[PDB]
Amino acid sequence: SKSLKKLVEESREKNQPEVDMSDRGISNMLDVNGLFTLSHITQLVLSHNKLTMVPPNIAELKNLEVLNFFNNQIEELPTQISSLQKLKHLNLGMNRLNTLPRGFGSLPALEVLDLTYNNLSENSLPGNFFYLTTLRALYLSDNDFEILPPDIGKLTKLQILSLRDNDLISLPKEIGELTQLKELHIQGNRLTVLPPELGNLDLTGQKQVFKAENNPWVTPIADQFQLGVSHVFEYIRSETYKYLYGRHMQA
Amino acid sequence: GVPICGACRRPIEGRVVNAMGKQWHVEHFVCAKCEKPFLGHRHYERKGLAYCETHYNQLFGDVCFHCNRVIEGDVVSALNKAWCVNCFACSTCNTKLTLKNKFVEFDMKPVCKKCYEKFPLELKKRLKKLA
Ligand SMILES: [Zn+2]
Ligand SMILES: [Zn+2]
Ligand SMILES: [Zn+2]
Ligand SMILES: [Zn+2]
């Protein structure tokens, strides 16, 4: 119930690390009064507002480890967003991002990035995006990705990768290189063929996940899906399969 | 007097291996999954029990999906992932949750019921035919 002045001023004297301003109809963070003096907060929630942009002032909030802009209307981020040296959790889902800013992968600490439900594609990603090697959870579901960059293989600490409901015509073979991968959601795309190198992953355990429904798979994979998870990885490690892949890529 | 072992519940006549308030026999101060004892090796307590090194991890070694340090104390298990009781929360408004709250699996993240209500109808319609 408190107004935007009491939540700014009480988090400075009572010394609260965690500000919540979720669902407060803010259109603009410079209107939140003295918000950017709060240079010792570690968590800033602004989901469910009406933000159209994040201002360069985000950079003074030096010690943010959690920054949640979920379900706003942001068309653009400031390059300063990558200077948050303590930042680990960044949530940008349900926004209107079709681009990311210069040097976004410069985040030295980031561990969970969530870009779900935007207008992102491969061209939206800046060049240094995969210097984000601290990342272990990357959610890109509901976007317009037609190809995933080969450099996905450099996110070696990745345990979770969601590409649900994108436009992917193919998986990059480098996904085999993500040893620590636990969850892989690729439901909803235009995949017809898994890359054989993906068999290097064992996602058949119970604390692991591999969803892939609603994809125009080729009939021999479709039928290993009916049989269960492990029967697809077996069949893609297959050598009968390998002769399929190469004669498919050229067809 | 003579102290009384904590396992066989007989009194001890030889070496009295004091540990965890109770007194023990040399061969009965053991690990709680594999049977064998320590014999002077070091113990790892947990709520009255004790384990060796290479088993103490396999149980009490779940790691908090939020803060990534290994969970000491109560272990919230949900959605094929694990949380510290104070780390578990809504993934979209970061207010704290318990397994007794109503929440929704969204790409295996927890979403509080109030937050799910604000999702685009396009999206909610499609997720009810997924998993
Ligand atoms: Zn005994
Ligand atoms: Zn043991
Ligand atoms: Zn934790
Ligand atoms: Zn919520």
Numbering used by the authors:
A (entry chain A): 2 to 252
B (entry chain B): 189 to 319
From the article:
Ras suppressor-1 (Rsu-1) is a leucine-rich repeat (LRR)-containing protein that is crucial for regulating cell adhesion and is involved in such physiological and pathological processes as focal adhesion assembly and tumor metastasis. Rsu-1 interacts with zinc-finger type multi-LIM domain-containing adaptor protein PINCH-1, known to be involved in the integrin-mediated consensus adhesome, but not with its highly homologous family member PINCH-2. We also showed that Rsu-1 can be assembled, via PINCH-1-binding, into a heteropentamer complex comprising Rsu-1, PINCH-1, ILK, Parvin, and Kindlin-2, which constitute a major consensus integrin adhesome crucial for focal adhesion assembly.
Our structural results reveal that Rsu-1 folds into a rigid arc-shaped architecture with eight consecutive LRRs shielded by two terminal capping modules, and it engages via its extensive conserved concave surface the LIM5 domain of PINCH-1 in a pattern analogous to some LRR–protein ligand complex formation that is referred to as “hand-clasp”. The superposition of the structure of Rsu-1 bound form with that of its unbound form showed an RMSD of 0.56-Å for the 249 Cα atom pairs, indicating that Rsu-1 retains its rigid architecture, and does not undergo major structural change upon the binding to PINCH-1. The conformation in the C-terminal region of Rsu-1, which is disordered in the unbound form, essentially remains the same structural arrangement as the unbound form, suggesting that the C-terminal region is not involved in the direct binding to PINCH-1. The analysis of electrostatic surface potential of the Rsu-1-LIM complex reveals that each protein surface displays distinct complementary charge distributions and binding architecture at the interface. Two polar residues of Arg165 and Asp166 from the seventh LRR motif of Rsu-1 that are highly conserved across species play a prominent role in the interface, by forming salt bridges with Asp295 and Arg314 of PINCH-1 LIM5 domain, respectively. In addition to the hydrogen bonds and salt bridges, a hydrophobic residue of Phe71 of Rsu-1 that contacts to Phe307 and Thr280 in the PINCH-1 LIM5 domain also significantly contributes to the binding interaction. Our data revealed that the calculated melting temperature (Tm) of Rsu-1 bound to PINCH-1 LIM5 domain (Tm = 67.7 ± 0.5 °C) was significantly higher (11.6 °C) than that in the absence of the protein ligand (Tm = 56.1 ± 0.2 °C), suggesting a significant preference of the interaction for the increased protein stability.
